[PDB]
Design a protein around this ligand. Structure first.
Ligand code: I7K
Ligand code: I7K
Ligand code: I7K
Ligand code: FBP
Ligand code: FBP
Ligand code: FBP
Ligand code: FBP
Ligand code: OXL
Ligand code: OXL
Ligand code: OXL
Ligand code: OXL
Ligand code: MG
Ligand code: MG
Ligand code: MG
Ligand code: MG
Ligand code: MG
Lengths: 431, 419, 417, 414
């Protein structure tokens, strides 16, 4: 089963990243084999959303948070003025662009606008959504979404210039949970807003709503965010409680694409340490996912597909598991081909090469997608331009530790230019 | 009738995959089964009053923990007396036994631990939570310090450091059960690795059929606040979903301002989480991993649990002298409540360590005809079950008994209709 | 390790196949009953004694040939051969008598007369030819008069309509026969295996007996050894889930009737050990609906307990055979030793795979619990004499809480002393 | 629905059996190859043409009987019949030499040399009892016989007991039930057959089920119920090939025997429970860093996701098609090759349909690869494998020559 690859890659490789637990035949055996001495090796795949506020607004502090692992900056429009939020956005952009001198240092960071909330779309939300479009935000976290028409109202308020902005619906009350299917259908993703949910429904039922919503989003292949009070005590203390570390680990094990920090980064005394703690827990929890059952169940539950991007994605993930591929390099214009690979939860990192700065920021919503922004002008021959981008992903991957000489990588491309034509999977040996 | 299959997450229970099971979990599907995960409450100034202890017993406290890292022997003797007074204040059909557990100060075996363990035997404690167990010889030392008079006391080894996790298998083999002592574990190993040690230890204890306790900071914010954080409710629910037999409260009940509410909160979460367990996979995996056995108690237990699942039995009523027959039923995680009828006050207290075991203390002297004595105890289990809401007329129950008096002879399973 | 136990412990069906071993000898008693057709080659009392010793459990009388007088003589000869072993408990074996009708536009006049002959001669089973719909079964049931309601009706599926209306036929029948001879002429020959596998699967799911019939060892009508396809066919019928396997021309007119019975016995024993019980039991459990019938609930608990301890046997007390049939439906590896006072139920339970009938004729004890104990001990002592059990073995015992049929609700684990 | 698709979607093997339907017609092309023994009843060119049309894929020459001159004439007649057949529909037919048997006999050395000189594709080596027997056959084939496939016949107790060492050095196995049924108890042959088929399926190597499959058809026009069951169960067991011996070599109904195996195999292939089979084969196949192996599992997974009508693969030696076949896709594996020997030999692998490419070469290697893929599509449409609107998976490599398969592409037809 694993004997030839154990001889080739070594016993040390197979003792890391919870690989003994990954090879177990049952979920019970998988738990029994989890090992505190089995170190994570893969890059952290669950994105961290940090709320920006008084403790995390300065350019110097934002540079530290980007280095600690922040992928998405959340602006809570329930507090502060438009002037206050515009300055936060400018500071985030200055900190992000301070690393732009090279693909080895650059890390795209998405900007998300979290609305104040509502009897339908409020007048303040209309003004805040217009502010978001004018300031080029990547994502909207829509507060108190209760039905599909609430999403349509947010979409209309973004106007024709905001068509590319992702709408993540926040489920915060009983109606949102009950009408979940209709809301998910029209949203780009979901946020389990546990703060309000824990007041709107009995506190002892929140975990059921969280697990159900994460499961349904995983089945739909749409991003899901777990939010609120994940590391709450870290607002005043340098180390979290045992329940808080457990909560972050279990959100990742449940299947969350993103985890969030609110007061921990907006007002707390340890914003950088809170990001570092979520980073450390998420890497441990990602390695502990039982991929054997998860991949089997995602295949069994997902309907058959005639979409070549979907068909190539499952073949690429299956191939990555067969050879313990270090990465899956994918070319993408909108992020969709990377999202379809992410839905099958590969252990291999999905390195997404794109010319779209906005798609590079938005793909942080999908677990395990590492965006690489390609800035070179197009080659005269399209096939050469595709090859250059694949080589850019390989060289960036090698220079950044994702790839090593001798590794196998899976490369996912399409047959013609433009979004929607991904249909090729190639197995390449890194030299 | 019809609403039965809507409740207790039964639509999610019938799912063909774990992913579909999650997708079918419903916040409107109310729990019906009695809460199976026992609650351990640490005794302290917030919970020493006899009147406060009566409220904690009513709220759901099953085991009272005495932390010997604080207070003198005189202090702990008063704690024991107050717990016993509150427990004995309670109507034999509704009486709830409450175990007393002694949690040692810790270290080899210290001289203070030798004195504290002798105090425990002299005061009749049921369980010892042995601190900082690092190897099998630590358990043997605790057992020797309990002496010949403490042979019946259960030893739960607390795993609190790297060595304890690494030598886990040898420790589990000689212990009655384990406690995942997350407080010290979270200081001894990186905080971000504690969940791995917790999940591994719970999985291994579930495989071994031995009790496992999840402990420390589960509802920490309720020491000062009336409602817990979202991470705390998640932590309690995930400990139950992981497979913990018991969950614990430390500062929340010993020194905080909401000891009764903290017990009520663990009770409420545990009931919701138990209904959300995917028994289809869990039972299949426990059966597959459990070795073949020639012990009639073990063979009867798996047959009884299989029968209970076939008919959606409301309960499995088992007669037990030491608690062993109830423990062997519990290891297969039936959805049916295991109602354990015993004359041993100590066994009635100790079986709270096993998930889904509801002990009933039978006080009547033995009937002259042994089959009549067995029947009267089964009827006592039924009448208690009806009064407490476990059973109703028309329910099916599985009754587990043995072929002769004395411990060790369980060998019969019977399907009974409640009249 | 014997009885394919290394293959039994495999985690996948593919691994199970890879671990099958020609040197792993079968130990369990043969569980699939053998039905032999009685005719010119197998009618004599001396030949019938050899067929009983070789393993024949059910004698089939084909009413498409011969007179009532001819068949009455065959029945008398079978009964004389069976009773010749009534002095030795080690060799006495009940043998069922099955009447196979000539067939039909509805119930034929000849079938009414032949079914009446069956009732008058005390036959145990009817193999009803060309059953095409539920009303055909109702007609056979009505023709079984006021005296034969206890006779089992096994519907023969022999044409396209019978296959298409299978669910309605199975619902009203006691069991099914896959009558491959006519089926292979009525539908394309290359589709018969699909109908066979589907019908066996559905009968296994319903917990009703299914017989695989016709041309299983055909070449043995003239040759002393079968072809490689014929041994394969018998083994695959057992692996498919057939409760019984049948011989027609091989025993009725062939030159090697005893050898044909011996060959089916030898193959069935090898094939039964090769069954992948791990998957079979899991799938039977998952597909069977929840039940509030204590006999059904006790049966699954007893089979689960037998697997847990590798029990040598499950001893069950039964008056009608129903408690043994409900144990058989879960396909335990342990032999189901059925202790009954009903001579008819003892003959009829041969239709259920793995049921070994023991006819008990002691007068009833005044104290019911003592009468139950005496019968359980009779099953144990017969099991020891026949090689099923030894001192130290574990056995599962299934009984009810009060006398009379329909109250099975107890499972006990006993250590043999 | 057709091709037992209701049974294919079942959640358990038991439910799969319950859903099998005699009215659900097979649509896929027959995947299990038929080996027919050539003899007096099937030697003529006219008879051989009818056998090729009926479905014969491999012609077996039994060197236990007849002279070298007799077998050379049989080979010439098979080749004349094959070459009588339109490049988009041409069907390659392999020639297999079945040795007399024993260490290596002097007669076998002469017969193996005859085989090399006459360009046989396969050797069915009789009575293989250990790895050194396979080495001796390989040595007797010499340097000119390097490309010939050796299928070891397991015929006795020793061969069964030393099976793993024999399989390791052989190209495949034949379950030679005739001798096996005399060497071991007849009632144990099914265990040896099921074990050997299971182990060959795990190893990804061809396995042949042989002897007395349709025996009664030597004198009768229709087989017995046990014979149709035997053929169906060999396919369900996982056999890559099924064989006819006396039925085609000396019987009165050789063509009808081939037609009967074709009809049963098609029905049995649709009745395979792919949901369990693919999951088990995928789980048991070892992890690998070989790009052909990695591409093969990705291609089979992709084919199942979209209900692909076919997987078109370019192959020089047949290896890339064999690695796809080992995962038992429901999609036909259309193997496009320029090697006539590889086209003949790939009949040993279930579900591989060889197409011998004889179109003019393109100047640009990438255009030449594209035209070979288009040839597979056009041939597929003509033969009924593909229709406009179908999805196909295409498996190719990054450079010319064997061993470089590393690409899988999803293509919509027309
Ligand atoms: O907070 C912790 C803790 C934190 C970090 C690492 C380990 C621990 C720990 O082990 C622990 C804790 C608290 C208590 S207590 O219930 O508050 N209490 C019982 C007795 C006294 C009282 O009656 O108040 C004082 C202590 C424990 O009993 C206990 O074991
Ligand atoms: O030759 C007699 C016979 C001769 C004189 C007086 C009585 C009989 C007689 O009773 C009898 C005979 C033959 C057959 S059979 O060859 O076993 N037959 C072949 C296949 C049949 C089928 O495809 O359905 C069913 C079975 C019987 O079944 C049967 O009972
Ligand atoms: O090769 C000839 C042949 C050559 C020259 C002159 C005459 C003949 C001839 O008459 C003949 C041949 C082969 C076979 S066979 O069917 O292959 N045979 C069946 C038994 C074995 C098996 O079960 O696998 C394989 C051997 C015959 O049956 C047969 O009659
Ligand atoms: O993930 P998306 O948005 O569908 O983009 C995938 C597209 O990227 C490509 O690989 C390259 O296209 P471009 O040259 O237009 O960037 C296409 O072949 C493919 O259709
Ligand atoms: O669970 P344990 O300690 O083995 O006790 C089970 C015992 O209880 C009984 O059911 C009743 O025994 P007693 O009448 O002695 O209480 C025995 O038949 C059986 O052996
Ligand atoms: O299988 P059946 O026909 O329902 O018979 C089972 C019956 O056998 C018994 O075990 C013994 O009953 P009898 O004493 O009347 O033979 C009953 O308790 C049970 O109801
Ligand atoms: O299956 P094999 O023998 O490895 O052949 C596969 C080879 O066929 C090809 O697809 C085409 O190669 P050729 O152009 O030499 O025919 C190669 O890219 C690949 O390596
Ligand atoms: O709005 C939120 O983020 C919440 O309620 O958790
Ligand atoms: O001792 C304890 O309970 C701990 O450290 O958690
Ligand atoms: O009647 C039968 O037995 C048959 O046709 O197979
Ligand atoms: O050699 C063979 O083919 C046989 O014996 O079956
Ligand atoms: Mg909110
Ligand atoms: Mg501690
Ligand atoms: Mg008839
Ligand atoms: Mg007929
Ligand atoms: Mg031979």
């Amino acid at each position: 089963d694993v004997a030839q690859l154990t001889q080739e890659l070594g016993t040390a490789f197979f003792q890391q990243q919870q690989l003994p637990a990954a090879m177990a035949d049952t979920f019970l055996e998988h738990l029994c084999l989890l090992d505190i001495d089995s170190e994570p090796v893969a890059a952290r795949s669950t994105s961290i959303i940090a709320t920006i506020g008084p403790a995390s607004r300065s350019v110097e502090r934002l540079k530290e948070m980007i280095k600690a692992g922040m992928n998405i900056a959340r602006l809570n429009f329930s507090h502060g003025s438009h002037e206050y939020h515009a300055e936060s956005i400018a500071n985030v952009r200055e900190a992000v662009e301070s690393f732009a001198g090279s693909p080895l240092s650059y890390r795209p960071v998405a900007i998300a606008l979290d609305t104040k909330g509502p009897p339908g779309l409020s007048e303040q939300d209309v003004r805040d959504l217009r502010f978001g479009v004018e300031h080029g935000v990547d994502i909207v976290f829509a507060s108190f979404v209760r039905k599909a028409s609430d999403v349509a109202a947010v979409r209309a308020a973004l106007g024709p210039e905001g068509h590319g902005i992702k709408i993540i619906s926040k489920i915060e009350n009983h109606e949102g949970v009950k009408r979940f299917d209709e809301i998910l259908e029209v949203s780009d993703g979901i946020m389990v807003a546990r703060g309000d949910l824990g007041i709107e429904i009995p506190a002892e039922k929140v975990f059921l709503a969280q697990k159900m919503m994460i499961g349904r989003c995983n089945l739909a292949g749409k991003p899901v965010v777990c939010a609120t009070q994940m590391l709450e005590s870290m607002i005043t203390k340098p180390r979290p409680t045992r329940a808080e570390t457990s909560d972050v680990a279990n959100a990742v094990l449940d299947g969350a694409d993103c985890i969030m920090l609110s007061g921990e980064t907006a007002k707390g005394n340890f914003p950088v340490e809170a990001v570092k703690m979520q980073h450390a827990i998420a890497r441990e929890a990602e390695a502990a996912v039982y991929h054997r059952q998860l991949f089997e169940e995602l295949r069994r539950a997902a309907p058959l597909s005639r979409d070549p991007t979907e068909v190539t994605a499952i073949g690429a993930v299956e191939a990555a598991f067969k050879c313990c591929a270090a990465a899956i390099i994918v070319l993408t214009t909108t992020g969709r081909s990377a999202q379809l690979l992410s839905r099958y939860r590969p252990r291999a990192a999905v390195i997404a090469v794109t010319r779209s700065a906005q798609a590079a920021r938005q793909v942080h919503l999908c677990r395990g997608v590492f965006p690489l922004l390609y800035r070179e002008p197009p080659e005269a021959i399209w096939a050469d331009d595709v090859d250059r981008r694949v080589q850019f992903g390989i060289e960036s991957g090698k220079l950044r530790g994702f790839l090593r000489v001798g590794d196998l990588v899976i490369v996912v491309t399409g047959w013609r230019p433009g979004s929607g034509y991904t249909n090729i999977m190639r197995v390449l040996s890194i030299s």
